[PDB]
Amino acid sequence: IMFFEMQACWSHSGVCRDKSERNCKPMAWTYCENRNQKCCEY
């Protein structure tokens, strides 16, 4: 990576759910892919 600030959570891992999930954990810079789903803390 030489510019891609953030990135998927393929390594950091996490729970890929709805951005407005009522049961999400302390997500990290990592994400899932779509702006509708975020990668929260496993």
**Phi-psi sector, 14: left (phi>0), alpha (psi -120 to 50), beta:** left
CATH for the stretch 1-42: 2.20.20.10
Helix, strand or coil for residue 40? strand
Residues constituting the chain: 42
Q: What is the dihedral of CA 7, 10, 12, 13, to 10 degrees?
A: 120
Q: Convert 1-42 into a string of H (helix), E (strand) and C (coil).
A: CCCCCCEECCCCCCEEEECCCCCCCCCCCEECCCCCEEEECC
Domain ranges in the chain? 1-42
Look up residue 2 and give its two tokens: 């030489």
Give the count of alpha carbons within 13 A of 42, CB side only: 6
Task: Identify the CA nearest to 31 among candidates 14, 15, 8, 11.
Answer: 8
Task: Identify the CA nearest to 28 among candidates 5, 17, 14, 18.
Answer: 14
